[PDB]
Subunit: 340 residues, 3 copies
């Protein structure tokens, strides 16, 4: 850390200057010999090549040194010079006037790189750090440029979660998060990341966010017309093996032997929902049971007879299904077609 | 821009240059004082301390500047130097050329560290933008340096995707794009992003295609040998409660009942597959039942009464499955049998 | 390779120096004109403009050159010169003194940016690849900084790898390696990508690891207390379509039946859980069935009492349910009824 002085203009910027050659003829300046020793010789002594210190050469030498320092201060990188002799070793970094005069860092991939970086595929153009933060499909910590915030101490609420790897740090604190992405019968989300991405179709915004919690359920929700739809939670093979969706314990006191459905039918009931209905006591008769708390259907027999006698009994599991036209509990197992 | 035109070579770098000492007790051109006041005495004074201006020092002075300038021009970063006084400050970078010969830029991750950058963990190697863009395993828009192409412009085949995720700003683009899957409880994909990550094991481009919509319906597949495999869709909880895929309604020809299912039934004939069917009419004779038109086979139950009539009550589902090797439907659930 | 020897201290560091005048009316070593033509007349002629080369002017010139060169050699880059003529053009990464004490590189993005790097949004950092990659949840090579190591042809240990993406060049070498997922209706994991990442959680820092195989059937799992949870093989909608996962072909000897299927029914028999099991032969009386060794319970009919026989045909697939209080499995449908 040493700070040079601001070079406003190189020395002898608008002064007479002469080009310093590489080869010598007489007691003249060079670039390999520089000031010649042999014809260094007494200038006021009538000697053949007797030379004097050259104002033009020394002024241009100072001009060159000051120009290099000035360009170093401003652009931090030598401009790539057209067909410079000697070539470029690979991984060399330069910046030079681009197509528009807009310039970016260029790094060469080949030795003896004689091609101009604007015309070279070997020279690769290197933009800034925002280009990395864009190249990641979702920036860590949301729009936040720094990685800090990618893991969140308090469960990041999903009322504004649209993008970014908002990793969730403490499961207990995420239990308090609203719009919790956990399958039903679970209170709140656990620790884990959210692959969340958002893309704008004009004024409207479409986005989706997926998230695997500690337990393992994969919850993915998408914004619909400016409002997030409730998460979809992956049906795990343990979930299917449990079969909690299609069965419950028997509930309801009279003319109803409903099952408290955990989980209940999301999005209502449409056609032929199958439930292995439990009856800890014998069915009363035409039972208008409120399965899932919203589907209220009256059970009638498959033989168009009431199920009061012998069809449904106590301590029973018997699968009952909807009717599309009837919206009634037709039997799939347990209540038979009685002989008479 | 200010263009410090490249000097072909340093000044006097084949001739003579006496090194510049740090201090000179004899009052010569040192570094602490530069040109000493002794270089100001008149030489005609007959003062011995009057030092005439030598050029070996002049040549070395000009050579230092010219060589530093050309190193800046031709190799960007300063070469690392053995034992820099004070080591190197934090975030200071140099280039320590390796045995390979390529320039190896190194950043100082440790304050005031003097460790040899070639064999230093502190002197971290500064990789190329290609290295960073390859170090991200899921790059948007393939391998491009730009992050553009997040949302696909039009309906285009997902075969172009190799490794990365792409958003979808148009609900038209998801359907119109080739290889658009048949979503659960939907015609096609909603406007949600899709990931296709295919490791290029030559012709065995092992791929994963994670497709997700607004509601959270999820789908996957993978490409191989010039063709993508089937689409695996993760089951829904909302779909799991209803069981719409397993549920079905019989249709088609009389007593040769087929089925139409949303989403379409796949997998063909597999050992012991559920055939749930609202029979469109009451059977009066030889009755055959199948789902998705897989195959019309006779139904045999526990009592083994033949195809006579009433075995398939109209609209009565029956969660029956066909014998794996018998090629005949075994009634499983909801068996309506009238006495004939 | 051009390595201009280390500059320990600039020329005329603590010596006398004359700040070069920017422009001089009477030609006096000004920057605009350099050494003006009046620095060439003989001093003996006594003409008024007989200037001589000033020691302090020469000292200041060489000081500027050596100071800039040494700053480049040590800190890689010029400092941020406040009061910069014309601000800083686009892509200008000045090294800036830290308020804390670390040197920090801020790049001006906008042409002629003129605000202080610390207190401006225009200046953006260009940090090292370490803190840079910290923004990637899933870095290539996992822990490895380089892109390599992500793909291992050999069946590397699944336990030791904790973060990053793992690709296996061979699909079956995943099964050869430990902790390979067993997808439904699939022997083992196919050739897919494993995304694994570990977050701090306080006492038990936790990681999520999911393998998405080539077909797409995903296995989400969670490293619990350093021990991974068994892979969660997401059942897909065509697994629901086939119904094979829930289907079972129970061993058919009379009065004793054994039930098992892969993927395993975790938890075995559950209160009010039903399974579709094929009994090949008849059963004379109260039979037996169990899953996973939780408990073997008797098999009966709709009367819930030991069966009489004739309630099942050759190869009858039956839905057997288990209730907590009854502790019995009964042929719910497809069963003739007899009262005990």
């Amino acid at each position: 850390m040493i700070t040079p002085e601001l070079i406003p203009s190189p020395f002898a910027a608008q002064g007479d200057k002469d080009p310093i050659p590489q080869t010598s003829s007489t007691g003249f300046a060079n670039l390999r010999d520089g000031y010649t020793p042999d014809y260094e010789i007494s200038l006021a002594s009538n000697n053949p090549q007797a030379k004097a210190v050259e104002r033009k050469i020394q002024n241009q030498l100072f001009f060159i040194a000051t120009q290099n320092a000035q360009a170093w201060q401003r652009q931090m990188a030598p401009p790539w010079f057209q067909g410079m002799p000697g070539g470029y070793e690979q991984n060399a970094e330069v910046v030079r006037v681009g197509n528009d005069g807009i310039m970016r860092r260029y790094r060469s991939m080949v030795n003896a790189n004689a091609s101009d970086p604007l015309s070279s595929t070997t020279w690769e153009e290197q933009p800034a750090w925002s280009a990395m933060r864009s190249n990641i499909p979702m920036p860590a910590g949301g729009p936040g440029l720094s990685s800090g915030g990618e893991v969140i101490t308090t469960g990041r609420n999903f009322n504004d979660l649209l993008n970014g790897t908002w990793e969730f740090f403490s499961d207990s604190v995420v239990i308090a998060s609203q719009n919790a992405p956990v399958y039903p019968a679970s209170a709140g989300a656990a620790a884990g990341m959210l692959e969340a991405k958002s893309w704008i179709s004009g004024s409207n915004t479409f986005c989706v966010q997926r998230y695997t919690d500690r337990v393992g359920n994969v919850a993915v929700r998408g914004l619909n017309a400016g409002a997030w739809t409730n998460w979809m939670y992956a049906v795990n093979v343990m979930a299917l093996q449990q079969g909690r969706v299609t069965y419950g314990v028997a509930a309801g006191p009279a003319n109803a032997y409903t099952l408290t459905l955990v989980p209940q039918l999301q999005g209502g009931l449409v056609d032929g929902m199958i439930l292995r209905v439990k009856f800890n006591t014998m069915n009363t008769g035409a039972s208008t049971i409120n399965v899932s708390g919203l589907g209220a259907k009256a059970i009638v027999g498959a033989a168009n007879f009431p199920l009061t006698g012998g069809e449904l009994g106590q301590g029973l599991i018997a699968e009952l299904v909807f009717d599309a036209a009837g919206d009634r509990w037709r039997i799939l197992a347990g209540a038979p077609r009685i002989q008479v």
